[PDB]
Amino acid sequence: YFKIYSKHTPINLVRDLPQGFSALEPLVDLPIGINITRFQTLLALHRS
Amino acid sequence: FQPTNGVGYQPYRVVVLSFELLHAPATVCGPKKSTNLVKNKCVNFNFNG
């Protein structure tokens, strides 16, 4: 089972993580059934 | 394939459905027949397992 929990929070702090409490709601459970040992973030470039 | 051919020579469309169970969670399920809801009585309830 692949559990994805998520939470959206409106913050206005410039640099670091804000200090507070916010429990993450369960968003989606995925029937993947695969081995995962490594991950990588995906970003977006800005072209001009 | 001619329309005047015999039944042993007429075209037959064949669809073969293959059902396998793997160790991943099974997600192609059948329709789960739902009994109408009855309230205010001592009944045996089965809600989502």
Ligand SMILES: *[C@@H]1O[C@H](CO)[C@@H](O)[C@H](O)[C@H]1NC(C)=O
């Ligand atoms: C999952 O992957 C890791 C690293 O590739 C490996 O050591 C481990 O044995 C794998 N587990 C299964 C159940 O395949």
